[PDB]
Write a protein that binds this ligand. Structure first.
Ligand SMILES: CO[C@@H]1O[C@H](CO)[C@@H](O[C@@H]2O[C@H](CO)[C@H](OS(=O)(=O)O)[C@H](O)[C@H]2O)[C@H](O[C@@H]2O[C@@H](C)[C@@H](O)[C@@H](O)[C@@H]2O)[C@H]1NC(C)=O
Ligand SMILES: CO[C@@H]1O[C@H](CO)[C@@H](O[C@@H]2O[C@H](CO)[C@H](OS(=O)(=O)O)[C@H](O)[C@H]2O)[C@H](O[C@@H]2O[C@@H](C)[C@@H](O)[C@@H](O)[C@@H]2O)[C@H]1NC(C)=O
Ligand SMILES: C[C@@H]1O[C@@H](O)[C@@H](O)[C@H](O)[C@@H]1O
Ligand SMILES: C[C@@H]1O[C@@H](O)[C@@H](O)[C@H](O)[C@@H]1O
Ligand SMILES: [Ca+2]
Ligand SMILES: [Ca+2]
Ligand SMILES: [Ca+2]
Ligand SMILES: [Ca+2]
Ligand SMILES: [Ca+2]
Ligand SMILES: [Ca+2]
Ligand SMILES: [Ca+2]
Ligand SMILES: [Ca+2]
Ligand SMILES: [Ca+2]
Ligand SMILES: [Ca+2]
Ligand SMILES: [Ca+2]
Ligand SMILES: [Cl-]
Ligand SMILES: [Cl-]
Ligand SMILES: [Cl-]
Ligand SMILES: [Zn+2]
Lengths: 149, 149, 149
């Protein structure tokens, strides 16, 4: 009995695990996730960078990062407004790095940006036409999280 | 070993409960839930009050209740049309109460409403402009449920 | 302990099954699923017919099939642009069948369609106006999956 009951329960658990994964797939699909493409999502709430990082981390994601023009366009279409990107030069001025580590491989700065304006701007937002502008991390912009392809 | 397998099962169940809660958190977020705010959802189906209340209940929610102007605006935007609110005066005519308890505090009544028109109107709907009107609970309005903050 | 823990685990698994069921109901509702009606979902990605079939099967759904004018309109609203239907005449040229088997019980063919134009057209797409046109299965159309009522 015992061993049989246990084996049966292990079978149910694995079935439930598959069932949850299906739920996750269907959710992503319904939200527009494209096949083999990163899933970007927003609640359309504007908050300071620290909060954005906190929120995405809590959802086990990361602040959205465009690796190329294709992803930059996808992020733009999702936010529909100015949104923080997972890129900052907080650690070392002038040297932008992804919040997940690494230096920039792709950028789409606006005319005369980055300018580290005034007191200093260490964060980055994707604005009009998907162009970038560095801004104060304390400002409040749309939170856009990223999930695996 | 039976105990090793049992210990693994506890870990599997725990891992699963955590993943399921993450799936719930991501869904809410993707549905527009703002941090520390209750969120509203609708399938855009029109139905009499009894069915909205029942439906929201089986989803572990409640028929939408605007506790203030911000929330009133949030419900209006989600609903897009006339929707039932979780407010009625079925228990004592003239005394509006929340479906979950308590006397109505914040209100956004239209001019000359509530009027318990004709044979009577005990339910409440939020109309296109966000104002409220009391109506028959048998009328079919959009089903909007709210889930805790 | 062993038998007590084993019994509790059974209770834990059943509780999780109920929770996931609920998560599934809430998601369907959030996506506009109406009571007693099938629901169609799309990520708005264009792909060849074989890919749509593969994707819907992976979501445990089927490629969208309109059984009447109501569902035909429903699918059209969801897709927003030309999408594949789960109908093809791949088995026997001229004999359109559901991907789920059987002859069509309802059709909305545009004038002089289906015509197996040129090199051949064995798949079907619901155009922007709801009418049907048979087209090449290799063309990229919007993926719309169907789930039961
Ligand atoms: C003079 O005051 C107005 O008189 C109208 C005619 O009696 C009222 O409208 C009627 O309301 C009926 C509801 O009992 C019914 O409406 S329903 O179909 O929407 O249920 C009648 O068809 C309708 O003519 C009017 O009531 C207000 O507008 C109605 C459309 C309805 O929304 C009511 O709930 C409103 O109170 C009434 N207006 C006022 C301000 O007294
Ligand atoms: C019922 O099974 C399916 O029948 C279809 C109709 O015959 C097959 O498609 C046809 O395949 C032909 C070659 O066999 C030819 O395609 S080709 O030009 O690419 O050669 C016809 O134009 C085409 O309509 C279908 O075959 C499969 O799909 C084809 C598009 C092609 O990729 C073939 O290699 C495939 O086998 C066939 N499906 C299967 C799974 O056999
Ligand atoms: C007012 C300043 O204008 C310029 C921008 O690049 C800066 O970010 C700042 O907004
Ligand atoms: C351009 C061609 O026109 C004709 C149609 O029957 C074909 O499906 C195709 O659309
Ligand atoms: Ca700096
Ligand atoms: Ca800087
Ligand atoms: Ca700047
Ligand atoms: Ca009354
Ligand atoms: Ca009166
Ligand atoms: Ca009344
Ligand atoms: Ca009234
Ligand atoms: Ca053919
Ligand atoms: Ca051919
Ligand atoms: Ca054909
Ligand atoms: Ca054709
Ligand atoms: Cl800064
Ligand atoms: Cl009533
Ligand atoms: Cl074809
Ligand atoms: Zn979902």
């Amino acid at each position: 009995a015992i061993e049989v009951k246990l084996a049966n329960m292990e079978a149910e658990i694995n079935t439930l695990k598959s069932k949850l994964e299906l739920t996750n797939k269907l959710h992503a699909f319904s939200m527009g996730k494209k096949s083999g493409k990163k899933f970007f999502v927003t609640n359309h709430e504007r908050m300071p960078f620290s909060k954005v990082k906190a929120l995405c981390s809590e959802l086990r994601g990361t602040v959205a990062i465009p690796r190329n023009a294709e992803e930059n366009k996808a992020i733009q279409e999702v936010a529909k407004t100015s949104a923080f990107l997972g890129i900052t030069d907080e650690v070392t001025e002038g040297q932008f790095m992804y919040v997940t580590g690494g230096r920039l491989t792709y950028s789409n700065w606006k005319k005369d940006e980055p300018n580290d304006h005034g007191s200093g701007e260490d964060c980055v937002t994707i604005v009009d036409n998907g162009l970038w502008n560095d801004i104060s991390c304390q400002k409040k912009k749309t939170a856009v999280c990223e999930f695996p392809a």
